[PDB]
């Protein structure tokens, strides 16, 4: 009955495609061509954070929009005071092959993980003056590509075993496991209300999940290459992706389809990271051409370029107040732009 | 600056100094990537996640990285080994007839993919040809015909081993800035560490010539 089941799956896919086509009446560009564009955005580098001696893969802002954590191949997790370019902590890592890092919203914990298939949790606040590792989370069968905190006791992880997981830091156990991707999941994006989250994988698909119930609600398929970056809109009703097809696409949760495409003919390198502005008007994306391109989300027009790195831009992120953008890259430098 | 901002700057400088010392100690070390097929055997040259083994051979510190337990897309994590000193590739000469697609052709495809990788253009490869005794005892019964329909040679250990090694280095493209070192693994001897030592010494000499800017 394999052929019959495949035919049923194809019929269901055709029905979903027909529904998606029927739900489209006017494109986003058609009804945003009458909005006022922003001409150019010239952001200068305000701070250059030096101290890393290897390639920077991830960085995360804090809630206070002043503290940030960065991870590099040197085996160090450095907490920076971005206002004075001061270094608060320098956390050695048991494994130097880190690929992601996160900041707890309470500011008490920092997480990291990578090729060791372990998500480590570190305690910043301690009676002694040293940062101590709280516990190691094991159970993933592939590299950890992203991790995000829900609260002090819940963290969500994405791995290369085509599976996302939700952990309980009190007991170090898998509360809920997410399955359905056929490729390695590379990026995570928690919703503003922390009830859903989207994940983009190597199957050129993005899946919207339910944290509490544990099932997949929607699947978005427009990309032609593996998705490296994902980020939620500030209102939580849309998200943007980035893959190695030199293309960013904005998907809608309610309309259940792609809205806008952000691509250029002269751009051929892949996208390593993506983020949104505070109002959601700007889409900042990091590329492999040592550059960060600022996109007008509602117009699909390049509004600026952040050209200050001599190697591949691997991560970026906007503060919670929209004050600054921290761009990390492979030249062992972090740059704060405003 | 306040009385505590100055102390914060002092702490920042202290951990700057610690970072510099740690970076110097790390830069005084060589890094090796252990690759190859699973059936070839990566534990012969040594005796969840990736395994790092550290050893010191005549005042040189080594950092092995076995990545054989990562059953994922290599293209998504092979770039983190861009700065490795050398790659140790293990291929068993005994698997020219066993089929899980012949194992030997799987090793050939993996060698071709690694050698011409866009991240390892000038990265040397230390080819290890393992299972010499089993291959020698096996070539007297099954010849190289199953592995190579176009062999057209004799049936002896030396000629067949040389032919396999020649084909494996013939897989190399752009043989101008890359060197392939081929060694036959010795059972009752400690010459493998010596061979890796000479390969990494040549790589250090090349890097010092490039740094001194007379290459």
């Amino acid at each position, epitope marked *: 009955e394999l052929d019959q089941l495949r035919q049923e799956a194809e019929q269901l896919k055709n029905q979903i495609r027909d529904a998606r086509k029927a739900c489209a009446d006017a494109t986003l560009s058609q009804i945003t061509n009458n909005i006022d564009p922003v001409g150019r955005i010239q952001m200068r580098t305000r701070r250059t954070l030096r101290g890393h001696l290897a390639k920077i893969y991830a960085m995360h802002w804090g809630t206070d929009s*002043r*503290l940030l954590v960065s991870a590099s191949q040197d085996g160090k997790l450095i907490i920076w*005071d971005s206002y004075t370019t*001061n270094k*608060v*902590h320098a956390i050695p890592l048991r494994s130097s092959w880190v690929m992601t890092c996160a900041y707890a919203p309470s*500011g008490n914990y920092v997480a990291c993980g990578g090729l060791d298939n372990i998500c480590s949790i570190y305690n910043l606040k301690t*009676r*002694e*003056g*040293n940062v101590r590792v709280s516990r190691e989370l094991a159970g993933h069968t592939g590299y950890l590509s992203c991790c995000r905190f829900l609260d002090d006791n819940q963290i969500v992880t994405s791995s290369g075993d085509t599976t996302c997981a939700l952990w309980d830091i009190e007991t170090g156990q898998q509360t809920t496991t997410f399955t359905g991707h056929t490729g390695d999941v590379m990026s995570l994006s928690l919703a503003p209300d922390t009830r859903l989250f989207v994940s983009g994988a190597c199957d050129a698909s993005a899946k919207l999940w339910d944290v509490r119930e544990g099932m997949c609600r929607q699947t978005f398929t427009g990309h032609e290459s593996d998705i490296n970056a994902i980020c939620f809109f500030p209102n939580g009703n849309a998200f943007a992706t980035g893959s190695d097809d030199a293309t960013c696409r904005l998907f809608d949760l309610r309309a259940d389809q792609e809205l806008m495409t952000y691509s250029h003919d002269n751009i051929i390198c892949g996208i390593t990271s993506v983020s949104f502005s505070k109002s959601g008007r700007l889409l900042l994306a990091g590329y492999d051409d040592f550059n960060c391109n600022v996109w007008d989300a509602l117009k699909a027009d390049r509004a600026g370029v952040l050209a200050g790195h001599d190697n591949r831009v691997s991560c970026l992120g906007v503060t919670d107040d929209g004050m600054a953008v921290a761009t990390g890259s492979w030249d062992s430098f972090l740059k704060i732009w405003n | 600056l*306040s*009385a*505590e*901002d*100055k*102390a*914060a700057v*002092e*702490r920042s400088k*202290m951990i700057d100094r610690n970072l510099r010392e740690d970076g110097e100690k790390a830069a005084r070390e060589v890094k090796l990537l252990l690759l190859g097929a699973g059936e070839s055997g990566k534990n012969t040259i040594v005796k969840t996640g990736i395994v790092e083994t550290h050893f010191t051979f005549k005042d040189l510190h080594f950092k092995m990285f076995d990545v054989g337990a990562q059953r994922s897309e290599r293209k998504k994590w092979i770039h983190c080994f861009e700065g490795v000193t050398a790659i140790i590739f293990c291929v068993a000469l005994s698997d020219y007839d066993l089929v899980l697609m012949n194992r030997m052709h799987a090793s050939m495809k993996l060698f071709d993919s690694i050698c011409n990788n866009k991240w390892f253009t000038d990265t040397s490869i230390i080819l290890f040809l393992n299972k010499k005794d089993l291959f020698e005892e096996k070539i007297k019964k099954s010849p190289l015909t199953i592995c190579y329909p176009e062999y057209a040679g004799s049936n002896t250990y030396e000629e067949a081993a040389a032919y396999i090694q020649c084909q494996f280095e013939d897989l190399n493209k752009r043989k101008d800035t890359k060197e392939i070192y081929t060694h036959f693994t010795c059972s009752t001897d400690t010459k493998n560490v010596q061979f890796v030592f000479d390969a990494v010494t040549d790589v250090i000499i090349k890097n010092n010539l490039k740094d001194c800017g007379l290459f």
Partner: single-chain antibody
Framework: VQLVESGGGLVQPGGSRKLSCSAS????????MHWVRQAPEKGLEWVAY????????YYADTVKGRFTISRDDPKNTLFLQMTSLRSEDTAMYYC??????????????WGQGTTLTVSSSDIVMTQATSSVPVTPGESVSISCRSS???????????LYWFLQRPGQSPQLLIY???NLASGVPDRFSGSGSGTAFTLTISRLEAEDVGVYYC?????????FGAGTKLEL
């Protein structure tokens, strides 16, 4: 976490003594150390400071040139060498932990202290209130007035509140103005602006009795204030 001081005892005037302090329970090298003394019937007074890495050393004016502060990080010991002892340096000497980064809680831990007996400009903090009569379950306010504004251009008001219970070493309640400390119940509130500051206890308890000291960390030397004693 414990700092245990040693030394002290009777000493002839003009003599010499060396005070010690064994630290055990924390990353000693990462903490800056302070020495603070207290006369047998008076308030606290800052003496000396040594930073992490022994980079910066600061002394009080009344002790400069005769007192030497030092640390031995591998053996986790802090020293205070005393030379030319006068009759005005008879007190109980405390050791205070102090760490310094963004969001730190300096002066968090204090030692028990040892007594030394000798045989026979800086801004000031004013606490005019003393011997304030209190009752359990009430709300009291303890006021501290300085001579200069402690609000720096960093936006931090550098006012510290301490509680010395009878027979016990002082404990930090609020490190920067309106910043509660670890282990302190959430009934102590800090308030103030510029020169005037207040510490408010919404609900009282029998363990909240003692002497409340007010300290400034804006600029050296660190100056305390004559504490406002609470009593029933």
């Amino acid at each position: 976490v414990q700092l245990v001081e040693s030394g002290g005892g009777l000493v002839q005037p003009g003599g010499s003594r060396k005070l010690s302090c064994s630290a055990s329970g924390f990353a000693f090298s990462s903490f800056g150390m302070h020495w603070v003394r207290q006369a047998p019937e008076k308030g606290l007074e800052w003496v000396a400071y040594i930073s992490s890495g022994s980079g910066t050393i600061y002394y009080a004016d009344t002790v400069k040139g005769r007192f030497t502060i030092s640390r031995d990080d591998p053996k986790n010991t802090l020293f205070l060498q005393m030379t030319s002892l006068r009759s005005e340096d008879t007190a109980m000497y405390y050791c205070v932990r102090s760490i310094y980064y963004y969001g730190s809680s300096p002066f968090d831990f204090w030692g028990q202290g040892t007594t030394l007996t000798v045989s026979s400009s800086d801004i000031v903090m004013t606490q005019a209130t003393s011997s304030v009569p209190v009752t359990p379950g009430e709300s009291v306010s303890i006021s501290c007035r300085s001579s200069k504004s402690l609000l720096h251009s960093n936006g931090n008001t550098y006012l510290y509140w301490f509680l010395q219970r009878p027979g016990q070493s002082p404990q930090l309640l609020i490190y920067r103005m309106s910043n509660l400390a670890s282990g302190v119940p959430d009934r102590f509130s800090g308030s103030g602006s510029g020169t005037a500051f207040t510490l408010t206890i919404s609900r009282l308890e029998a363990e909240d009795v003692g002497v409340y000291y007010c300290m400034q960390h804006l600029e050296y030397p660190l100056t305390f204030g004559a504490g406002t004693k609470l009593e029933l």
